[PDB]
Amino acid sequence: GSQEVRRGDFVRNWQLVAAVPLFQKLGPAVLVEIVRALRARTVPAGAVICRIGEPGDRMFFVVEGSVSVATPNPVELGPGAFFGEMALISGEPRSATVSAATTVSLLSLHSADFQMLCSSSPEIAEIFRKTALERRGAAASA
Ligand SMILES: Nc1ncnc2c1ncn2[C@@H]1O[C@@H]2COP(=O)(O)O[C@H]2[C@H]1O
């Protein structure tokens, strides 16, 4: 364990998780366990966060900044948004390539932590499937 002046990273993650209500649906011991499982990591512009084809084994949540999807008809993502749950939702490969348009701070969640947190809250699992369906399709498939 490096850098331990006064759990500054853990404190920042607390406030970071506070920016996400999805994590608020988790109990106290769950949210605390999810916080100790999740880590805040910033991706520099041009840094690929997700690559189509690659298997998703972690989640991503934008805290500050915007992101751009790698495709012919991508979209602009902002803070308070989550992505890369479709894989952790089912296991399918990156539905599309994700690339941070600029330096944005996001949090990382373990696949095991995702299934454990989803097990804690059945609503969070439904919210994920809703986004997975929307992200996966919900327009074409239909
Ligand atoms: N149209 C879209 N808008 C926002 N996010 C998307 C869109 N399409 C795909 N994604 C995200 O790209 C991610 C690729 O990894 P996942 O499939 O696990 O989860 C996918 C979605 O969260």
Side-chain angles (χ1 to χ4, degrees), residues 50 77 83-87 93-96 98 135:
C50 327
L77 283 168
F83 50 110
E85 62 272 316
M86 228 297 243
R94 259 61 243 272
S95 32
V98 156
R135 267 82 181 279

Side-chain angles (χ1 to χ4, degrees), residues 51-55 93-97:
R51 189 235 150 202
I52 173 147
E54 76 110 327
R94 259 61 243 272
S95 32
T97 281

Side-chain angles (χ1 to χ4, degrees), residues 44-115:
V48 173
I49 317 167
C50 327
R51 189 235 150 202
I52 173 147
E54 76 110 327
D57 288 278
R58 51 227 152 168
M59 251 303 272
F60 297 73
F61 311 78
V62 174
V63 179
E64 193 102 286
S66 283
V67 162
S68 263
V69 182
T71 117
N73 269 100
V75 161
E76 201 194 289
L77 283 168
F82 36 104
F83 50 110
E85 62 272 316
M86 228 297 243
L88 297 181
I89 276 158
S90 235
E92 280 246 60
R94 259 61 243 272
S95 32
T97 281
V98 156
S99 65
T102 187
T103 322
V104 307
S105 207
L106 36 76
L107 311 123
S108 88
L109 186 78
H110 224 276
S111 168
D113 237 53
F114 187 92
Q115 239 176 69

